[PDB]
Amino acid sequence: GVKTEQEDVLAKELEDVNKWGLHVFRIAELSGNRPLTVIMHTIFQERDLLKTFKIPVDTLITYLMTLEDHYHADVAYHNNIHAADVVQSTHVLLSTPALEAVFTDLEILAAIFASAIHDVDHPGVSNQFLINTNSELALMYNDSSVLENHHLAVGFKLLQEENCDIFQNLTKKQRQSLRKMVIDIVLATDMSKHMNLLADLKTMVETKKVTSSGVLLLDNYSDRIQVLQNMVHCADLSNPTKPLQLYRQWTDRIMEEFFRQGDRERERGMEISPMCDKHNASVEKSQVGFIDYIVHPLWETWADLVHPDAQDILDTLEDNREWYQSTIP
Numbered sequence: 001g002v003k004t005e006q007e008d009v010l011a012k013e014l015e016d017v018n019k020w021g022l023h024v025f026r027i028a029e030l031s032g033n034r035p036l037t038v039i040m041h042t043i044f045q046e047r048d049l050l051k052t053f054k055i056p057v058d059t060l061i062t063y064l065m066t067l068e069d070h071y072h073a074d075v076a077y078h079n080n081i082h083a084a085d086v087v088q089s090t091h092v093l094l095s096t097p098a099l100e101a102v103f104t105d106l107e108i109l110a111a112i113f114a115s116a117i118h119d120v121d122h123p124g125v126s127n128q129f130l131i132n133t134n135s136e137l138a139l140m141y142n143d144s145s146v147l148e149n150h151h152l153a154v155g156f157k158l159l160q161e162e163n164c165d166i167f168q169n170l171t172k173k174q175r176q177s178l179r180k181m182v183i184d185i186v187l188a189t190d191m192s193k194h195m196n197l198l199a200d201l202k203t204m205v206e207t208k209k210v211t212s213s214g215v216l217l218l219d220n221y222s223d224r225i226q227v228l229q230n231m232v233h234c235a236d237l238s239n240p241t242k243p244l245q246l247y248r249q250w251t252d253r254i255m256e257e258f259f260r261q262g263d264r265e266r267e268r269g270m271e272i273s274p275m276c277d278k279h280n281a282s283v284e285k286s287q288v289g290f291i292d293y294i295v296h297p298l299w300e301t302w303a304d305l306v307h308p309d310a311q312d313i314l315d316t317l318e319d320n321r322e323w324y325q326s327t328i329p
């Protein structure tokens with residue numbers, strides 16, 4: 001009735017779940033490659049989501065293990081560890097003081113569940129790649145947000161496996177509302193929505209109303225969903241805002257995946273893709289561009305929205321950017 005020592009050591013790492021910079025690779029090791037399961041489980045307990053939504057525990061574990069098993073282990077970046085990290089990041093973002101008591105449990109659950117499924121069954125290559133190779137996924141989704149339509153459909157479909165329906169006691173109203181939120185959040189992880197999402201987040205900060213004390217007011221679906229959409233998208237682009245030991249690992253793993261797409265574009269290649277070659281284009285300049293044009297404009301705008309809650313995160317982002325710069329000849 002008491003834990004094993006590996007389980008204990010894992011429980012002790014998991015005490016860092018509410019903090020930015022969790023040792024997620026270590027959790028993956030300690031969990032036997034189950035970081036998405038142990039983290040989602042921990043989060044659901046801490047947020048009381050099992051009681052609130054009458055989720056049987058064995059059903060949750062069954063679904064989570066099934067979900068984690070359709071993330072590919074032979075993909076270096078877009079795997080269960082990335083899912084876990086994004087779940088845990090979204091989890092922290094939701095506890096930010098500026099958002100205290102703003103969102104409902106169904107919203108919280110949508111944000112978390114979305115984060116969990118958002119890259120499921122990712123094949124390790126890009127939308128453009130899938131489209132140019134005339135792949136079945138691109139044909140099925142009529143070329144638009146191919147991967148993101150796929151992740152949603154797999155995540156939802158897995159609820160139908162044996163003892164996997166975690167939402168079996170939600171009413172139809174809740175299930176319809178949850179389903180819609182989750183669709184809207186995951187579709188927003190397509191990077192081609194980045195510029196519009198960011199515009200709409202800048203507009204919100206311009207017009208930012210406030211409640212009785214420092215907490216945002218969001219009185220319509222369109223704004224609430226916008227915030228949750230930019231929240232999960234922030235989490236998905238959170239690697240450069242982590243301690244550098246973490247960030248470097250993520251960079252290695254993205255580079256492997258992208259070099260591997262390169263190597264799969266020699267025969268086909270439909271001609272090389274953006275800065276993915278050992279021959280040319282530094283890894284370091286690529287991180288500096290990523291941070292300058294994408295990651296920092298987003299996190300900066302997020303930081304005004306939740307001011308001063310994100311200062312530390314933005315500081316780390318800026319330190320990491322100066323570090324990558326300083327490593328360029």
Ligand SMILES: COc1ccccc1COc1cc(C2=NN(C3CCN(c4ccc5ncc([N+](=O)[O-])n5n4)CC3)C(=O)[C@H]3CCCC[C@H]23)ccc1OC
Pocket residue numbers: 189191236237239240250251254255258274275276286287288289290291293294
């Ligand atoms: C810019 O970083 C590059 C570039 C090439 C190779 C490696 C990295 C490493 O950075 C990381 C990127 C990513 C992601 N990347 N992308 C996009 C980003 C924009 N993009 C280009 C292409 C060419 C170019 N020239 C100048 C720019 N520029 O700076 O504006 N670009 N941006 C296409 C690829 C995804 O689709 C996302 C899926 C979901 C979320 C995030 C994913 C994740 C972690 C990363 O590092 C840990």
Ligand SMILES: [Mg+2]
Pocket residue numbers: 118119147189190
């Ligand atoms: Mg994705």
Ligand SMILES: [Zn+2]
Pocket residue numbers: 082086118119189236
């Ligand atoms: Zn992702």
